[PDB]
Design an enzyme around this catalytic site. Structure first.
Site, PDB file in Angstrom:
ATOM      1  N   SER A 141      30.577  33.524  48.640  1.00  0.00           N
ATOM      2  CA  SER A 141      30.811  32.456  47.690  1.00  0.00           C
ATOM      3  C   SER A 141      29.700  31.426  47.692  1.00  0.00           C
ATOM      4  CB  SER A 141      32.139  31.758  47.973  1.00  0.00           C
ATOM      5  OG  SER A 141      33.196  32.686  47.963  1.00  0.00           O
ATOM      6  N   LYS A 153      45.689  27.678  52.546  1.00  0.00           N
ATOM      7  CA  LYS A 153      45.367  26.689  51.533  1.00  0.00           C
ATOM      8  C   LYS A 153      45.584  27.237  50.127  1.00  0.00           C
ATOM      9  CE  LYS A 153      41.774  23.467  50.190  1.00  0.00           C
ATOM     10  NZ  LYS A 153      40.370  23.008  50.246  1.00  0.00           N
ATOM     11  N   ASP A 154      45.560  28.559  49.963  1.00  0.00           N
ATOM     12  CA  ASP A 154      45.812  29.147  48.656  1.00  0.00           C
ATOM     13  C   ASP A 154      47.306  29.251  48.377  1.00  0.00           C
ATOM     14  OD1 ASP A 154      42.899  31.359  48.613  1.00  0.00           O
ATOM     15  OD2 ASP A 154      43.190  29.402  47.689  1.00  0.00           O
ATOM     16  N   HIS A 207      31.258  40.031  46.686  1.00  0.00           N
ATOM     17  CA  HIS A 207      31.203  40.364  48.100  1.00  0.00           C
ATOM     18  C   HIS A 207      29.780  40.579  48.602  1.00  0.00           C
ATOM     19  CE1 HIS A 207      32.730  42.604  51.763  1.00  0.00           C
ATOM     20  NE2 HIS A 207      33.594  41.613  51.665  1.00  0.00           N
ATOM     21  N   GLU A 223      48.441  28.800  18.360  1.00  0.00           N
ATOM     22  CA  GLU A 223      48.744  28.175  19.644  1.00  0.00           C
ATOM     23  C   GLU A 223      47.621  27.232  20.061  1.00  0.00           C
ATOM     24  OE1 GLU A 223      51.428  28.450  21.618  1.00  0.00           O
ATOM     25  OE2 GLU A 223      52.487  29.818  20.280  1.00  0.00           O
TER      26      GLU A 223
HETATM   27  C1  HEM Z   1      41.323  37.873  34.467  1.00  0.00           C
HETATM   28  C2  HEM Z   1      40.365  36.974  34.690  1.00  0.00           C
HETATM   29  C3  HEM Z   1      39.719  36.600  36.054  1.00  0.00           C
HETATM   30  C4  HEM Z   1      40.114  36.809  37.333  1.00  0.00           C
HETATM   31  C5  HEM Z   1      41.384  37.475  37.913  1.00  0.00           C
HETATM   32  C6  HEM Z   1      39.118  36.252  38.207  1.00  0.00           C
HETATM   33  C7  HEM Z   1      39.168  36.263  39.589  1.00  0.00           C
HETATM   34  C8  HEM Z   1      38.302  35.641  40.463  1.00  0.00           C
HETATM   35  C9  HEM Z   1      38.502  35.402  41.872  1.00  0.00           C
HETATM   36  C10 HEM Z   1      39.759  35.797  42.675  1.00  0.00           C
HETATM   37  C11 HEM Z   1      37.427  34.776  42.347  1.00  0.00           C
HETATM   38  C12 HEM Z   1      37.209  34.319  43.810  1.00  0.00           C
HETATM   39  C13 HEM Z   1      37.840  32.954  44.061  1.00  0.00           C
HETATM   40  C14 HEM Z   1      37.119  31.822  43.391  1.00  0.00           C
HETATM   41  O1  HEM Z   1      35.918  31.617  43.654  1.00  0.00           O
HETATM   42  O2  HEM Z   1      37.748  31.085  42.607  1.00  0.00           O
HETATM   43  C15 HEM Z   1      36.491  34.614  41.258  1.00  0.00           C
HETATM   44  C16 HEM Z   1      35.241  34.025  41.302  1.00  0.00           C
HETATM   45  C17 HEM Z   1      34.368  33.895  40.239  1.00  0.00           C
HETATM   46  N1  HEM Z   1      34.658  34.139  38.906  1.00  0.00           N
HETATM   47 FE1  HEM Z   1      36.488  34.897  38.143  1.00  0.00          FE
HETATM   48  N2  HEM Z   1      38.117  35.730  37.422  1.00  0.00           N
HETATM   49  C18 HEM Z   1      38.440  35.926  36.098  1.00  0.00           C
HETATM   50  C19 HEM Z   1      37.671  35.534  35.019  1.00  0.00           C
HETATM   51  C20 HEM Z   1      36.399  35.001  35.077  1.00  0.00           C
HETATM   52  C21 HEM Z   1      35.609  34.469  33.987  1.00  0.00           C
HETATM   53  C22 HEM Z   1      36.138  34.411  32.540  1.00  0.00           C
HETATM   54  C23 HEM Z   1      34.433  34.029  34.480  1.00  0.00           C
HETATM   55  C24 HEM Z   1      33.184  33.389  33.811  1.00  0.00           C
HETATM   56  C25 HEM Z   1      32.771  33.527  32.550  1.00  0.00           C
HETATM   57  C26 HEM Z   1      34.445  34.300  35.894  1.00  0.00           C
HETATM   58  C27 HEM Z   1      33.424  34.010  36.783  1.00  0.00           C
HETATM   59  C28 HEM Z   1      33.530  33.880  38.157  1.00  0.00           C
HETATM   60  C29 HEM Z   1      32.491  33.464  39.068  1.00  0.00           C
HETATM   61  C30 HEM Z   1      31.052  33.098  38.635  1.00  0.00           C
HETATM   62  C31 HEM Z   1      32.991  33.479  40.319  1.00  0.00           C
HETATM   63  C32 HEM Z   1      32.276  33.112  41.644  1.00  0.00           C
HETATM   64  C33 HEM Z   1      32.194  31.601  41.753  1.00  0.00           C
HETATM   65  C34 HEM Z   1      31.735  31.060  43.063  1.00  0.00           C
HETATM   66  O3  HEM Z   1      31.945  31.696  44.113  1.00  0.00           O
HETATM   67  O4  HEM Z   1      31.176  29.953  43.037  1.00  0.00           O
HETATM   68  N3  HEM Z   1      35.654  34.880  36.221  1.00  0.00           N
HETATM   69  N4  HEM Z   1      37.071  35.146  40.123  1.00  0.00           N
HETATM   70  C1  LIG Z   2      45.121  31.734  12.466  1.00  0.00           C
HETATM   71  C2  LIG Z   2      46.398  31.860  13.291  1.00  0.00           C
HETATM   72  C3  LIG Z   2      47.557  31.296  12.794  1.00  0.00           C
HETATM   73  C4  LIG Z   2      48.735  31.396  13.507  1.00  0.00           C
HETATM   74  C5  LIG Z   2      48.744  32.051  14.724  1.00  0.00           C
HETATM   75  C6  LIG Z   2      47.589  32.602  15.240  1.00  0.00           C
HETATM   76  N1  LIG Z   2      47.699  33.253  16.536  1.00  0.00           N
HETATM   77  N2  LIG Z   2      47.616  34.569  16.787  1.00  0.00           N
HETATM   78  N3  LIG Z   2      47.786  34.752  18.085  1.00  0.00           N
HETATM   79  N4  LIG Z   2      48.004  33.568  18.683  1.00  0.00           N
HETATM   80  C7  LIG Z   2      48.249  33.297  20.087  1.00  0.00           C
HETATM   81  C8  LIG Z   2      47.948  32.637  17.718  1.00  0.00           C
HETATM   82  O1  LIG Z   2      48.105  31.487  17.912  1.00  0.00           O
HETATM   83  C9  LIG Z   2      46.398  32.511  14.523  1.00  0.00           C
HETATM   84  C10 LIG Z   2      45.100  33.118  15.064  1.00  0.00           C
HETATM   85  O2  LIG Z   2      44.303  32.105  15.615  1.00  0.00           O
HETATM   86  C11 LIG Z   2      43.086  32.549  16.139  1.00  0.00           C
HETATM   87  C12 LIG Z   2      41.836  31.900  16.033  1.00  0.00           C
HETATM   88  C13 LIG Z   2      40.952  32.753  16.733  1.00  0.00           C
HETATM   89  N5  LIG Z   2      41.645  33.769  17.178  1.00  0.00           N
HETATM   90  C14 LIG Z   2      41.117  34.871  17.954  1.00  0.00           C
HETATM   91  C15 LIG Z   2      39.991  34.682  18.732  1.00  0.00           C
HETATM   92  C16 LIG Z   2      39.484  35.732  19.479  1.00  0.00           C
HETATM   93  C17 LIG Z   2      40.117  36.962  19.451  1.00  0.00           C
HETATM   94 CL1  LIG Z   2      39.459  38.304  20.416  1.00  0.00          CL
HETATM   95  C18 LIG Z   2      41.252  37.150  18.680  1.00  0.00           C
HETATM   96  C19 LIG Z   2      41.751  36.100  17.929  1.00  0.00           C
HETATM   97  N6  LIG Z   2      42.916  33.646  16.830  1.00  0.00           N
HETATM   98  C1  LIG Z   3      37.522  39.197  48.267  1.00  0.00           C
HETATM   99  C2  LIG Z   3      36.519  38.052  48.191  1.00  0.00           C
HETATM  100  C3  LIG Z   3      35.188  38.369  48.031  1.00  0.00           C
HETATM  101  C4  LIG Z   3      34.247  37.366  47.961  1.00  0.00           C
HETATM  102  C5  LIG Z   3      34.645  36.049  48.048  1.00  0.00           C
HETATM  103  C6  LIG Z   3      35.975  35.713  48.219  1.00  0.00           C
HETATM  104  N1  LIG Z   3      36.303  34.294  48.288  1.00  0.00           N
HETATM  105  N2  LIG Z   3      36.976  33.598  47.360  1.00  0.00           N
HETATM  106  N3  LIG Z   3      37.060  32.346  47.739  1.00  0.00           N
HETATM  107  N4  LIG Z   3      36.436  32.194  48.910  1.00  0.00           N
HETATM  108  C7  LIG Z   3      36.317  30.950  49.648  1.00  0.00           C
HETATM  109  C8  LIG Z   3      35.957  33.411  49.247  1.00  0.00           C
HETATM  110  O1  LIG Z   3      35.345  33.660  50.220  1.00  0.00           O
HETATM  111  C9  LIG Z   3      36.925  36.723  48.281  1.00  0.00           C
HETATM  112  C10 LIG Z   3      38.405  36.392  48.471  1.00  0.00           C
HETATM  113  O2  LIG Z   3      39.057  36.251  47.238  1.00  0.00           O
HETATM  114  C11 LIG Z   3      40.291  35.597  47.338  1.00  0.00           C
HETATM  115  C12 LIG Z   3      40.696  34.426  46.667  1.00  0.00           C
HETATM  116  C13 LIG Z   3      42.013  34.204  47.136  1.00  0.00           C
HETATM  117  N5  LIG Z   3      42.309  35.159  47.980  1.00  0.00           N
HETATM  118  C14 LIG Z   3      43.550  35.301  48.733  1.00  0.00           C
HETATM  119  C15 LIG Z   3      44.274  34.170  49.071  1.00  0.00           C
HETATM  120  C16 LIG Z   3      45.435  34.274  49.809  1.00  0.00           C
HETATM  121  C17 LIG Z   3      45.873  35.519  50.224  1.00  0.00           C
HETATM  122 CL1  LIG Z   3      47.379  35.642  51.171  1.00  0.00          CL
HETATM  123  C18 LIG Z   3      45.148  36.658  49.906  1.00  0.00           C
HETATM  124  C19 LIG Z   3      43.982  36.545  49.164  1.00  0.00           C
HETATM  125  N6  LIG Z   3      41.278  35.980  48.103  1.00  0.00           N
END
Ligand code: HEM
Ligand SMILES: Cc1cccc(-n2nnn(C)c2=O)c1COc1ccn(-c2ccc(Cl)cc2)n1
Ligand SMILES: Cc1cccc(-n2nnn(C)c2=O)c1COc1ccn(-c2ccc(Cl)cc2)n1
Ligand SMILES: CCCCCCCCCCCCCCCCCC(=O)OC[C@H](COP(=O)([O-])OCC(O)COP(=O)([O-])OC[C@@H](COC(=O)CCCCCCCCCCCCCCCCC)OC(=O)CCCCCCCCCCCCCCCCC)OC(=O)CCCCCCCCCCCCCCCCC
Ligand SMILES: CCCCCCCC/C=C\CCCCCCCC(=O)OC[C@H](COP(=O)(O)OCCN)OC(=O)CCCCCCC/C=C\CCCCCCCC
Ligand code: HEM
Ligand code: HEM
Lengths: 51, 62, 71, 48, 378, 148, 106, 47, 49, 54
Positions: free
Chosen positions: E204, E226-227, E200, E270
């Protein structure tokens, strides 16, 4: 790079280091009372750990 | 003129920011046995003579 | 970051039409497929040849495992 | 091993006929709003 | 006297979702962040039903799962939602990370760093839940992991003794795998709200990388509709797999109950852990495997520091995106190798592609961004 | 006046042979446009419905006073003579104007305002520091109400 | 620094210009730069006819990508007509940062 | 007085293309169903 | 206490609100007649049985 | 450049608990609202242990 090295940051590292060590030895000896590290409770034998 | 010359249902339906969220509740009817057609008509057409109510009349009356 | 605080702009004009003065689909398949064929000729020379390198390793990688068990 | 085999192939018909209704009808709400932006024109008129 | 602008609750909603300035040219790849929040609420609701009938006991656990699939009402549709609603979480997560890597979105440093924390807590939660059905893949996947966790030289051998409950495998063994699996999804939630408090501050990014403060539109009605269209297209493809092929992604060997007196023909995780399993078996040591595992997820934090280009996004960088799809076609190769037997061809390919994953991010990317600067005359 | 939203506003009623323009014009600073548009559009929709019998009586008194005050010398009377003969074909007297003002009440005002304003597409023009001028979708959605 | 085969490095600089496609949105090279804190100070120092030319070129290109469109091949920015309007102003902002840094090492 | 709104004839309705004599009438001879696009959505969001 | 209600021209706002009101009095006469599958008004219409 | 006043997380904590203007003569009866938030976190932690064995 050339952003980072000089006669400034490493003399700011001179009085850092005692801080680093007592930020490191805080992390060293502080980890052992929370997660029950039994391999380091042996080294100072005065503290009766578990009964 | 030539295009559809019927009634306009945006001076009553949907237009309300409320209805955007009220058609989970007020718009939640009218279409369950209109789609007991199709669903319960093409399932029991490809499955001809295979289900239990297609064969139970043999072991109904003694 | 609110709307009347984002930037500073001068000398630009915008003309827009109502949603009720427009037909729904102006140009659908007379303009649709020459526009998608333009975006496909651009980014398929960057995307696809990495994935044919996976393919030639997959087809060679199961032609060695099946000769590893026979004569 | 799979006693719900027949109950799931008919319940997967009571949603395929509900996404043939619902999905064209949110896509046309989408193209209505975005047509304002899709048709607009821009001009730059600086002093000579 | 606009109530959308002065009410204490309604201001926060209006500032975040309604009146928010958004770029006008946001494409379909920005939809998968709200699909991750759809997939997360679904796994929490479905998971709370499955917790009312499960019993954590290594004698009575494979039978608690068959009880919901054959006795409890709707238990077959709620169980197979959960096993398939986690494959959908992981396909949305890998598209989301590849978006932020392509369009340079890691330059929001406080947003990107909380993201890498979210990638660890998700991969650990899906591990604790797969051991819980307690079949022949749930047992022989947990003893492969805990062998690589008793190789840490100072904490490793007393840590695996705590997670198994002090024993090998009994009733109080699965009580700790079940407790951490219940809790960590409510921490993924709180880390995702802090994730969007940092986005925020700048708003974006957009496919062009160039800033867009002249050309903003409001978020409602343009991206609230659109979402919604993208969320209904996700529930279509999800319910296709629950009702037409619910066993397409899993494994049959997890329908044999857990018994060490027999042995399965293969060990297979998996589909979404197969890239991380082809890297453990590629290093013939229990120390250089647990270090090459955590280096594959921790290398994302070096991406802000390795950027040596004058531009932010990869839209105008044609040699840098030629290397983006060599990185995607190498995580596919590590997913096919990760479910093969450890034989002659499947180890020369498993280690020449565990090297190339690190050579592209750390070395080949920052040198090609410099050749691009030199051809644009900076 | 209380929230210093604008410098001035005016309504207009431009007419032609077959069509017309019916609306408003206002002048404000760059941070007040969106709030001026909210309050103006909410008073158009409060006359399509809800228009009172006391508002119409004051609006009829205002219209008679604007009629006779505009004819106070040889030059304004000569232009009301010369262009009434080209629009109406005759000069409407001031007795025929007043017997048409006497008929109007709140049901006629509610009915005639709903015919011209309710759920219609406006034309909008803006000039100056106008980044807070709202979007046309949010403008066109102001042309209804959320209850009636 | 080549002097005989400088024919070769000129073809590769042209080729990367057209393989990149910011010219097809009618942009100049200094429009596409990532704004860190040095670039945000060089933009503030531009003469007003150059600043207004850049804000319109960017707005026309964000609008062209909302509809997946390209300008016709008569309004594409040419290779030998891209004016590096920002590079003189930015070399002076960097040089004033490397002087406040060598003074803090004293 | 030198600017003119550009023509929208590639985006006009089937009939308002000709801008002569559809002043107020045919605002509903233009019009009776894509408002009801959102009406049958109500019945499609319904069950 | 509630002389906000009393006036010679606040009752102006009711007699055109009831032609709107009268009809949402029967949104239960269609909506919850369906939704609980109630026994009440099903055999009233000869189409829906 | 006070980090307690400009950090995005730390602003919210600073506005709500640190720099908040409070009356000077608040007595002991205003303490039982934070004791309700102590009693609530305790019942949630203790209740999750009891749910693993019920
Ligand atoms: C439980 C996992 C996550 C949730 C719920 C989440 C949620 C969100 C949401 C709602 C947005 C705003 C919409 C969008 O731009 O797509 C966003 C943006 C973003 N997320 Fe995630 N995210 C998650 C995991 C991650 C991970 C794993 C990464 C990177 C390693 C990441 C990096 C980013 C970045 C960099 C943005 C901003 C991108 C941009 O505006 O260009 N997030 N995230
Ligand atoms: C070897 C083997 C055999 C059968 C099932 C499963 N397994 N266990 N859970 N699920 C969904 C599976 O498929 C596995 C585990 O495979 C792996 C490989 C790397 N991770 C791992 C990576 C990061 C973290 Cl933080 C924790 C675990 N796990
Ligand atoms: C809060 C915040 C902060 C900064 C950037 C952005 N964002 N993310 N994408 N874009 C273009 C942005 O400006 C946001 C919005 O985060 C999102 C992503 C989906 N929803 C959403 C969609 C449908 C409904 Cl009903 C309600 C919520 N809100
Ligand atoms: C190979 C591996 C390399 C080793 C990696 C460690 C060193 C990383 C590094 O060099 O700098 C990165 C950077 C250090 O910042 P820095 O020293 O100031 O210099 C680099 C830049 O300035 C970047 O600094 P920055 O300020 O822009 O980073 C943003 C900030 C992130 O924003 C925050 O301040 C986090 C505050 C949120 C707390 C949670 C609230 C409750 C929910 O950084 C952090 O504080 C990291 C904490 C994120 C996790 C917090 C929640 C954990 C519980 O942050 C990290 O160390 C990342 C660690 C988090 C990911 C670890 C993955 C899990 C294991
Ligand atoms: C399913 C099998 C697995 C394959 C997944 C990838 C399939 C998607 C391929 C899409 C093909 C395609 O059209 O690519 C071009 C496409 C077209 O847009 P451009 O015009 O190139 O953008 C402007 C540049 N001028 O380019 C893009 O959109 C790139 C956008 C980012 C892609 C998002 C995700 C990509 C896949 C990511 C998975 C692997 C990375 C995850 C890293 C996790 C680390 C452990
Ligand atoms: C947030 C993401 C989550 C993921 C990725 C996830 C993943 C999984 C997986 C892969 C399984 C194995 C299913 C199988 O193989 O049959 C599982 C099982 C299980 N999970 Fe989840 N889960 C999540 C959230 C939750 C939550 C929040 C709860 C509890 C409230 C929960 C409770 C359970 C239970 C009780 C089982 C029992 C075994 C079974 O039913 O198969 N899960 N989880
Ligand atoms: C928030 C305030 C709560 C109150 C006031 C409350 C109150 C109570 C009471 C009065 C009992 C009966 C105690 C007895 O055994 O005599 C009880 C039992 C129980 N509660 Fe709670 N509870 C709260 C929160 C929770 C939570 C959050 C959980 C679970 C996560 C929980 C789980 C249980 C369980 C499993 C029992 C049965 C075990 C037992 O009877 O001791 N409670 N609760």
């Amino acid at each position: 790079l050339s952003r980072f090295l000089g006669p400034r940051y490493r003399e700011l590292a001179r009085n850092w280091i005692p801080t680093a060590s007592m930020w490191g030895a805080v992390g060293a000896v502080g980890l052992v009372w929370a997660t029950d590290w039994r391999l380091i409770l042996d080294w100072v034998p005065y503290i009766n750990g578990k009964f | 003129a030539a295009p559809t010359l019927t009634a306009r249902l945006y001076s009553l339906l949907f237009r309300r920011t409320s209805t955007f969220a009220l058609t989970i509740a007020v718009g939640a009817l009218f279409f369950e046995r209109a789609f007991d057609q199709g669903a319960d008509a093409i399932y029991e057409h490809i499955n001809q003579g295979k289900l239990w109510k297609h064969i139970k009349h043999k072991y109904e009356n003694k | 970051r609110e709307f009347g605080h984002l930037t500073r702009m001068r000398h630009v004009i915008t003309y827009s039409l109502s949603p009720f003065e427009q037909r729904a689909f102006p140009h659908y398949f007379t303009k649709g497929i020459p526009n998608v064929l333009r975006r496909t000729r651009a980014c398929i020379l960057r995307v696809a040849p990495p994935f044919v390198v996976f393919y030639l390793v997959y087809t060679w990688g199961t032609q060695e495992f099946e000769k590893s068990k026979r004569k | 091993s799979e006693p719900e085999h027949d109950h799931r192939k008919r319940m997967g018909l009571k949603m395929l006929m509900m996404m043939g209704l619902l999905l064209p009808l949110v896509y046309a709400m989408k193209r209505h709003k975005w047509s304002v932006l899709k048709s607009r024109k821009l001009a730059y008129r600086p002093p000579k | 006297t606009n109530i959308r602008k002065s009410h204490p609750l309604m201001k926060i909603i209006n500032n975040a979702f309604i009146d928010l300035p958004a770029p006008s040219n946001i494409s379909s790849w920005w939809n998968f962040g709200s699909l991750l929040g759809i997939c997360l609420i679904l796994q929490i609701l479905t998971g709370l039903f499955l917790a009312m009938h499960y019993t954590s006991d290594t004698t009575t656990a494979f039978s608690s799962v068959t009880h919901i699939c054959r006795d409890v009402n709707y238990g077959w549709v709620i169980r197979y939602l959960h096993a398939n609603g986690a494959s959908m979480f992981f396909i949305c997560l890998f598209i989301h990370v590849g978006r932020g890597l392509y369009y340079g979105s890691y330059m929001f440093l406080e947003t990107w760093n909380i993201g890498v924390v979210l990638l660890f807590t998700v991969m650990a939660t899906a591990f604790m839940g797969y051991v819980l059905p307690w079949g022949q893949m749930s047992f022989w996947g947990a003893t492969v992991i805990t062998n690589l966790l008793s190789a840490i030289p100072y904490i490793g051998t007393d840590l695996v003794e705590w997670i198994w409950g002090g024993f090998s495998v009994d009733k109080a063994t699965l009580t700790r795998f079940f407790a951490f699996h219940f809790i960590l999804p409510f921490i993924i939630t709180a880390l995702a709200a802090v994730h969007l408090l940092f986005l925020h501050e700048t708003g974006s990014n957009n496919p062009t990388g160039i800033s867009s403060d002249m050309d903003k539109i409001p978020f409602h009605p343009y991206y609230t509709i659109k979402d919604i269209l993208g969320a209904l297209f996700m529930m279509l493809i999800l319910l296709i797999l629950v009702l037409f092929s619910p066993d397409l992604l899993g494994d049959p060997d997890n329908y044999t109950p857990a018994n060490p007196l027999n042995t399965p023909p293969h060990i297979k995780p998996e589909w979404y852990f197969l890239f991380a399993y082809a890297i453990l078996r590629s290093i013939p040591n229990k120390l250089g495997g647990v270090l090459a595992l955590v280096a594959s997820i921790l290398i994302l934090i070096l991406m802000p520091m390795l950027h040596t280009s004058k531009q932010r996004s990869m839209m105008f960088r044609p040699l840098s995106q030629c290397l983006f799809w060599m990185l995607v076609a190498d995580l596919i190769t590590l997913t096919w190798i990760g479910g093969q037997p450890v034989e002659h061809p499947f180890i020369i390919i498993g280690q020449l592609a565990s090297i190339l994953y690190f050579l592209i991010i750390l070395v080949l990317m920052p040198i090609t961004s410099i050749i691009e600067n030199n051809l644009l005359k900076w | 006046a209380t929230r210093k939203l604008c410098q001035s506003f005016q309504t207009f009623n431009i007419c032609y042979a077959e069509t017309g323009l019916l609306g408003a014009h206002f002048v404000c600073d760059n941070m007040s446009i969106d709030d001026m548009m909210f309050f103006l559009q909410g008073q158009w929709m409060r006359l399509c419905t809800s228009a009172t019998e006391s508002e119409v009586v004051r609006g009829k008194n205002i219209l008679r006073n604007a009629l006779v005050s505009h004819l106070d010398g040889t030059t304004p009377v000569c232009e009301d003579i010369g262009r009434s003969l080209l629009t109406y074909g005759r000069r409407i007297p001031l007795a025929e104007w007043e017997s048409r003002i006497a008929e109007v009440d709140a049901s006629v005002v509610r009915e005639v305002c709903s015919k011209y304003f309710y759920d219609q597409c406006p034309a909008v023009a803006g000039l100056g520091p106008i980044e807070q001028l709202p979007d046309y979708n949010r403008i066109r959605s102001g042309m209804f109400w959320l209850r009636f | 620094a080549v002097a005989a085969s400088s024919k070769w490095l000129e073809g590769i600089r042209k080729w990367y210009y057209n393989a990149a496609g910011f010219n097809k949105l009618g942009l100049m090279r200094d429009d596409t730069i990532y704004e860190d804190d040095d670039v945000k100070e060089a933009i503030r120092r531009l003469p007003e006819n150059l600043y207004n030319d850049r804000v319109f070129r960017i707005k026309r290109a964000l609008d062209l990508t909302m509809r997946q469109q390209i300008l016709p091949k008569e309004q594409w920015t040419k290779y030998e007509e891209d004016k590096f309007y920002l590079e003189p102003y930015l070399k002076e902002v960097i040089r004033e940062r490397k002087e406040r840094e060598e003074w803090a090492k004293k | 007085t030198d600017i003119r709104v550009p023509d929208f004839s590639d985006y006009r309705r089937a009939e308002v293309l000709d801008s002569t004599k559809s002043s107020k009438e045919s605002s509903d001879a233009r019009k009776g169903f894509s408002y009801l696009i959102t009406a049958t959505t109500t019945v499609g969001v319904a069950y």
